[PDB]
């Protein structure tokens, strides 16, 4: 009978826990460290390209930092594949929302959108969750810049800054140490890069080992501008940190 | 519209006008109604041009897939099948009409189909408005064992008959030769007797002739 074979994903711990969720979180520990910060003027996105190599092609490669919308891009902690699913969906969802209201989605709506979607696997289906969590970087009309997060459990919060993947507590400490509310993006940039270089598990923090992006309302603007830095640009700003 | 095709000795060639119409009004002075189903299987269409193109794109896609899936060269019949198989399902409500032909491992093939799944086959085929004009040209000058040029020449003129004597047919001459041995050749505007004379006057305007309420520059990038 089929019963033999069910891992019974959604069943509660005797303590009321979901080990898959637990273990998904656990794989996320193994995920490449990814960090994001809501500055006063913008939001910074930097994450470590994990498991890199020489003939690994960096430029086209994005394994972490993906753009759902021009006001919403995200960093990914988890299976690259799984997120891309949710990535695509959210985009549509936003696009739908856009196509619904001709207006961009307030980030949480999209966030909570994916939140319950993860939660979909959580409470039903016998289906494994995604081993993925996210940095949600978004700008809205309402709260302006918004930095959110999610966990495979779908539980999700806002942040002034946040880190995911490995070394989170370390980063969190460094972040919860060094952060201050009024920080400008470029400060947070290096600050992360500082945190990154330090929380870097490898020897050196290098562009080719990183994905980086920013959400910023430019100086000539009224269009809050997302940007992913090119490896060189990353490598360039990598120098600007003095990290060189 | 006049679309034609003629099996010749070593293969088959098709032809159609470049004239596209909206009712009395020429929609496109020069269009292409000929379309590749597969490199060696080509078709042009009559009735709804959208349909003709639309379904054609679909089928060849399958054909290609099927061809890949078979890893063998397409066979006109399978397309021929799918079409009616496709079309007949729509009860002809997709009004496309097809002269479909192609050379394949099985050989050269020439086929006509109508919206409802009616499929016909013969050495020579013409469809569209002026097809009758062509069909005349066909019935008169078709003989068995046509050469390439015979196929070229005969098909050449049948189109013209439509071009000249059919209002829906005119503009320029499109030719796709499909020969068993070789690659097909698509001859666009193969014949263009219809060249418009130079305008008796240049109507170009002096600038400032127009009143501009307002001007602005549309941003492109972000």
């Amino acid at each position: 009978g089929s019963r033999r074979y069910d891992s019974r994903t959604t069943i509660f711990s005797p303590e009321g826990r979901l080990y898959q969720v637990e273990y998904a979180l656990e794989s996320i520990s193994h995920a490449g460290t990814a960090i994001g910060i809501m500055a006063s003027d913008g939001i910074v996105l930097a994450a470590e390209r994990k498991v890199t190599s020489t003939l690994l092609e960096q430029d086209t490669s994005t394994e972490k930092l993906y753009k759902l919308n021009d006001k919403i891009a995200v960093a990914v902690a988890g299976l690259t594949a799984d997120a891309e699913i949710l990535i695509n969906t959210a985009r549509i969802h936003a696009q739908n929302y856009l196509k619904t209201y001709n207006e961009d989605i307030p980030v949480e709506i999209l966030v909570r959108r994916l939140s319950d979607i993860k939660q979909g696997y959580t409470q039903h289906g016998g289906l494994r969750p995604f081993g993925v969590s996210f940095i949600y970087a978004g700008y809205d009309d309402r709260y302006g810049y918004q930095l959110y997060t999610s966990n495979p459990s779908g539980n999700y919060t806002g942040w002034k800054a946040i880190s995911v993947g490995a070394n989170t507590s370390a980063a969190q400490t460094l972040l919860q140490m060094d952060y201050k509310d009024d920080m400008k993006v470029d400060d947070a940039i290096e600050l992360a890069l500082k945190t990154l270089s330090k929380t870097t598990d490898s020897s050196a923090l290098t562009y080719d080992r990183l994905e980086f992006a920013t959400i910023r309302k430019g100086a000539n603007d009224g269009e809050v501008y997302q940007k992913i830095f090119k490896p060189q640009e990353i490598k360039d700003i990598l120098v600007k940190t003095g990290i060189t | 519209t006049t679309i034609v095709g003629v099996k010749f000795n070593n293969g088959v060639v098709i032809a159609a006008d470049t004239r596209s119409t909206q009712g009395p009004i020429v929609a496109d002075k020069n269009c292409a109604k000929l379309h590749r189903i597969s490199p060696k299987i080509w078709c042009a269409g009559a009735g709804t041009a959208a349909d003709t193109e639309a379904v054609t794109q679909l089928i060849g896609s399958n054909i290609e897939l099927h061809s890949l899936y078979t890893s063998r060269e397409p066979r006109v019949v399978s397309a021929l099948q799918m079409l009616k198989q496709h079309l007949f399902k729509y009860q002809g409500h997709i009004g496309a009409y097809l002269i479909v032909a192609g050379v394949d491992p099985t050989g050269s093939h020439l086929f006509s189909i109508h919206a409802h799944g009616s499929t016909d086959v013969g050495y020579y085929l013409s469809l569209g408005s002026g097809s009758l004009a062509a069909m005349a040209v066909l019935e008169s000058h078709w003989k068995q064992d046509l050469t390439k040029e015979e196929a070229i020449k005969l098909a050449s003129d049948a189109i013209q008959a439509g071009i000249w004597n059919d209002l829906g047919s005119g503009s320029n001459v499109d030719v796709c030769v499909m020969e068993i041995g070789k690659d097909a050749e698509y001859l666009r505007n193969y014949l263009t007797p219809n060249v418009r004379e130079e305008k008796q006057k240049s109507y170009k305007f002096p600038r400032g002739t127009t009143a501009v309420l307002k001007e602005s520059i549309v941003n492109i990038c972000d």
Binding site: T100, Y101, N102, P106, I109, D141, R142 | -
Partner: protein, 198 residues
Amino acid sequence: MDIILGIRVQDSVILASSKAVTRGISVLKDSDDKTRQLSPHTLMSFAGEAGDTVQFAEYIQANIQLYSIREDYELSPQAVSSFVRQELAKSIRSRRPYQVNVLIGGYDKKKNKPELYQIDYLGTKVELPYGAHGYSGFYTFSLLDHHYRPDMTTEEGLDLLKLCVQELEKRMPMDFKGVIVKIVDKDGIRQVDDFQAQ
């Protein structure tokens, strides 16, 4: 048909609706409301198919609040107009399409601006200084084209309204049994009770 009237003046939107109700020969209700409040700053007026024009209206009304309370937020009429059209866009191609023709008056807070959208049952949307439905505008727009100025105050259009109403009062064959006059502004929605005498 009924009479759905609206105007976006400088700082506010005024919405006017014929108060009559007719089934065949009889005028059932002369006191009727033909409008529904979507939000404090979003009011929607509508005329069209009897059951539908009610059903669709309230239907949408719940929807927004639902979203609204969901996000604990009052939407721009723009989105609302955007939204509503989408419904019509479906419904017009639905099995039994709504026949409904709406004015969404609204005051964008974020813009601090009134907003007046017209959408047909076809689901064609436009924001206007002023608008109508069916035979309504056919008399009026002239006066509006004549008199209207954007700056025109809350009180002013009302007069212009009454004139336009009077025109309809005069030129329209069917008695509309008075009109309701409501106003969307920064304060959102309120009904002016006294208009036929004004």
